[PDB]
Design a binder for this molecule. Structure first.
Ligand SMILES: [Cl-]
Ligand SMILES: [Cl-]
Ligand SMILES: [Cl-]
Ligand SMILES: [Cl-]
Ligand SMILES: [Cl-]
Ligand SMILES: [Cl-]
Ligand SMILES: [Cl-]
Ligand SMILES: [Cl-]
Lengths: 308, 308
């Protein structure tokens, strides 16, 4: 029964399978409202932008999603709950390319972009609500599985080091295939911490931050790709939050670019990651040392409490 | 002929000693105006606060300083210039304890402090104007000396590493005398950079930042004072600015204190340092990793240009 931005993830008495209906009935109430808020979002978009064929397509997806959800009858038994899970799965799949479609749509509407903020905000709101929905949906679905150390999508004993390492491997491979090598990554600080945490956010953010740190490093060592500065990550775990600092020695972010780094370039990783972090009660801050490198600070608040 | 916040430091053709009069006549025009602005500052202070005997004393010092400066006749020859230097030296000495007097005065007026901002701002404005005056005064006086690599207070080839080391030594001694030991300090990055720079700001800021980093380290290793984590400093020198990052592993600044750290506690080092940095076109940012340590970023803009 953890919490987030009005979203609530349930953890309850299985056996009877009663917990699945209390969760499903909640998911059934919540999804329509969140889908509706996004539809309003598309309705308030500047006419010229909302007219773009692609944007107009994504808008129709939200409308059709709202219809299917509103058409489903109230969950009364485990029989309905099961079918409702099928609807939800169809939706997540139907909206798998929403973000790609938006980028394409907004890119084409770049010439008409008058207000710079009312686009950064539209993408923030769209990407986050989409994360909140995926977390709510995925959690309920996960309540049907029985993985060890997981109550839905909530890991009861997550290891920041473990998850960071997973993505380090992922990121290093993409890097080697692209440059012939990749920076090793050292991890210090609270390397042995373990606590209840929802990995999903970290599953998106970390690989975005790790690819950036590794790229900057390679792009600034074109003369010695076979010998580059390590990327150093530090884990700070306290009762209020989890802090992961990712430091690279890739030259830093030039003064002339310090602004456009956090904007979308249909570069989505950094702006999306900050949105995600802020949506969850955390933050994403950059410290640039021009000529040397960059320090990125990812802060995420702990699960409805304080643990280490 | 370098620049700053409307302040201008002169560098010119000696020999004739003509450069000393063009500088003196400028210093003579500038000091009264800056002293006057501060007097207005004391006049706009809330009556209850400005009534404190001590605060009232400091206020009288500014008034008497303004009088002496306004009484001095226009500099016409090297003879006047020389005497004017004597006036200036008397002033800097008469106002040597201004800050200590203010703290004492404001501390006593703590009960009456209604507005929290209009005090932080009064101390900012008082401490900075005081720095700007000391830089203007000291520079002109320094134009009489003939030190190597110095045009007044402007060092023509300052070494951040060199100046940092000087203060590391200073800070380590105070630390050992207080704890029996002190963290070693490693310095990386652009350790060989050299460029025109005014050391004064760094002469105050660095020892304040270095004492904090060393203190936090000792206070969080009371069980092993003989073996503590190094303090690590990184120098980033580019064409726009000089960045000195000071990282300690002293536990960081607790969430509950993150606000009061940048306030005055009549703790003056951090708030004064940020004021100084901002006054000079730079900044002072803190990144706290609760449970691990703190990273402090000092940024100072280069002398009327771009060098490395
Ligand atoms: Cl269009
Ligand atoms: Cl999704
Ligand atoms: Cl890559
Ligand atoms: Cl530790
Ligand atoms: Cl009083
Ligand atoms: Cl002074
Ligand atoms: Cl000390
Ligand atoms: Cl280097």
């Amino acid at each position: 029964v953890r919490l987030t931005p009005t979203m609530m993830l349930y953890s309850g008495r299985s056996q009877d399978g009663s917990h699945l209906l209390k969760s499903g009935r909640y998911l059934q109430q919540e999804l329509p409202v969140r889908i509706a808020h996004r539809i309003k979002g598309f309705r308030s978009l500047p006419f010229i932008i909302g007219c773009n064929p692609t944007i107009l397509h994504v808008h129709e997806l939200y409308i059709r999603a709202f219809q299917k959800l509103t058409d489903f009858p109230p969950i009364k038994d485990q029989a309905d709950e099961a079918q409702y899970c099928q609807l939800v799965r169809q939706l997540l799949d139907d909206h798998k390319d929403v973000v790609t479609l938006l980028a394409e749509g907004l890119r084409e509407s770049r010439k008409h972009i008058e207000d710079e903020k009312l686009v950064r905000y539209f993408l923030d709101k769209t990407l986050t609500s989409r994360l909140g929905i995926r977390m709510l949906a995925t959690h309920h679905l996960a309540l049907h599985e029985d993985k060890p150390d997981f109550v839905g999508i909530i890991c009861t004993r997550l290891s920041p080091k473990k998850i960071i390492e997973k993505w380090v491997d992922f990121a290093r491979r993409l890097c080697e295939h692209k440059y012939g090598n990749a920076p090793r990554v050292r991890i210090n600080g609270h390397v042995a911490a373990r606590f209840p945490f929802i990995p999903m956010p970290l599953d998106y953010i970390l690989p975005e931050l790790l690819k950036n740190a590794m790229r900057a490093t390679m792009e600034s060592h074109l003369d010695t790709p076979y010998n580059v500065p390590d990327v150093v990550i530090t884990i700070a775990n306290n009762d209020v939050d989890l802090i992961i600092r990712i430091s690279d020695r890739g030259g830093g972010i030039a003064h002339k670019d310090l602004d456009r780094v956090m904007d979308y370039h249909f570069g989505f990783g950094l702006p999306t990651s900050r949105a995600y972090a802020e949506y969850l009660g955390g933050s994403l801050q950059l410290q640039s040392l021009q000529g040397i490198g960059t320090d990125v600070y990812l802060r995420l608040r702990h699960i409805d409490g304080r643990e280490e």
